[PDB]
């Protein structure tokens, strides 16, 4: 029942991640095309977890996270960052920006499941 918000400007990837969540049980998934479109929905309330790509137009992954964290209403949302390669500086920036975790594409449902569990475990959910 967790309402997930999947943010990626690549329609296919949003489809991949959605099927992976569904494969793990989560079907209350929503999709956004970029940080801005995500903020428009997140502000509508209802979401309990965010998964975002690092590179998107209008508002990228790192700015969307700073924006989310900076907003009191959206301060507690777990944010999982998806990336390619995952170079140190990025992990460090995502880390200091307050990311809940990051995963490198292409990941599998098994890999996604592990990440979701480390997050939930810390959060107790």
From Swiss-Prot:
Subcellular location, principal: cytoplasm
Gene Ontology biological-process annotations: archaeal or bacterial-type flagellum-dependent cell motility; chemotaxis; phosphorelay signal transduction system
Species annotation: Shigella flexneri
List of residues that carry 4-aspartylphosphate: 53
GO cellular component: cytoplasm
Listed cofactors: Mg(2+)
Record PTM N6-acetyllysine, positions in chain: 88, 105
Record protein name field: Chemotaxis protein CheY
Subcellular location: Cytoplasm
Sites where the protein binds Mg(2+): 8-9, 53, 55
Gene Ontology molecular function: metal ion binding
SUPFAM superfamilies associated with the record: CheY-like
Domain Response regulatory: 3-120
Matches recorded under PROSITE patterns: RESPONSE_REGULATORY
